[PDB]
Design a protein around this ligand. Structure first.
Ligand SMILES: O=C(O)[C@H]1CSC(c2nc3ccc(O)cc3s2)=N1
Length: 274
């Protein structure tokens, strides 16, 4: 019933295929993986910045998700733009849209928990969409992981997606990953080395988190101007609020949309080689 066109890739739950409905002619993305009920609820989520979950297929005791198809992800686009960099107006537009998507999902009590360039999809009209929202909770790369997760907190908040987005924001600007850790501790220490080793002053409760060790080295925080040059102060300001250690102090998606950084936001058209 579905015609395997090509392997889009390998996800976190299963393998992804570009597929054609051998009846409707529809071109879709197919992912082969209490969960049934939960992901079925996700079908109701509709937002221009969220990849549409078309249908949930539970058959032969196996689970397929049918998604709206988009041709390119942010990862491939960043690689293709690595020489020149993505223009600031397009970076700003993408960030603005992504925050809209987060704000919508967060208002409906849906988290992503696993944001990364590979699940951010773009099209020819200058739109960008979040894929895999709510899949983490339903079904039960460390670079974009929030520090509270790395410190073994069992209870996640919307703030984890904001951290991830912040990391992706910085990566778009510098054309290099912000915290490319190769293990949980390397990831953690890369964060510490840049933002300063967290303490009770900046993050009340941190020394009581399950995987926190008093034996953590004490790195001083470095100037933000060194981290995302040559982003202007509006952008650096927004980023620092997205990268607060304390998830309670970390800026929400709705508040982020009101940041002065987005005062001159537009919607440019990217040139894609599809
Ligand atoms: O599944 C993942 O972990 C990451 C890597 S593969 C992937 C993709 N998801 C979609 C969803 C819809 C679509 O048209 C393309 C992709 S690629 N997201």
């Amino acid at each position: 019933n579905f015609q395997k066109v090509e392997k889009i890739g390998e996800g976190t739950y299963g393998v992804v295929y570009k597929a054609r409905n051998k009846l409707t002619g529809e071109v879709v993305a197919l992912k082969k993986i209490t969960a049934i009920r939960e992901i079925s609820l996700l079908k109701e989520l509709n937002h221009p910045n969220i990849v549409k979950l078309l249908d949930v297929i539970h058959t032969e005791n196996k689970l397929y998700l049918v998604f709206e198809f988009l041709h390119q992800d942010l990862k491939k686009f960043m690689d293709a733009s690595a020489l020149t960099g993505i223009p600031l107006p397009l970076i700003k537009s993408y960030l603005f849209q992504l925050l809209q998507g987060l704000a919508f999902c967060h208002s409906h009590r849906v988290l992503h928990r696993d944001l990364k360039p590979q699940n951010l999809l773009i099209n020819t009209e200058g739109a960008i969409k979040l894929a895999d929202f709510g899949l983490a909770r339903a079904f039960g790369t460390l670079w974009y992981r929030a520090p509270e997760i790395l410190l073994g907190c069992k209870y996640y908040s919307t703030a984890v997606d904001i951290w991830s987005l912040g990391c992706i924001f910085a990566e778009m600007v510098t054309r290099r990953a912000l915290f490319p850790g190769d293990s949980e501790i390397d990831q953690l220490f890369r964060i510490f080395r840049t933002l300063g080793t967290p303490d009770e002053v900046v993050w009340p409760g941190v020394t009581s988190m399950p995987d926190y060790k008093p034996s953590f080295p004490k790195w001083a925080r470095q100037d933000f101007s060194k981290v995302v040059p040559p982003l202007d102060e509006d952008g650096r300001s927004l980023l620092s609020q997205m990268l607060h250690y304390d998830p309670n102090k970390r800026i929400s998606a709705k508040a982020a949309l009101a940041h002065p950084f987005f005062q001159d936001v537009t919607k440019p058209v990217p040139h894609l080689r599809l």
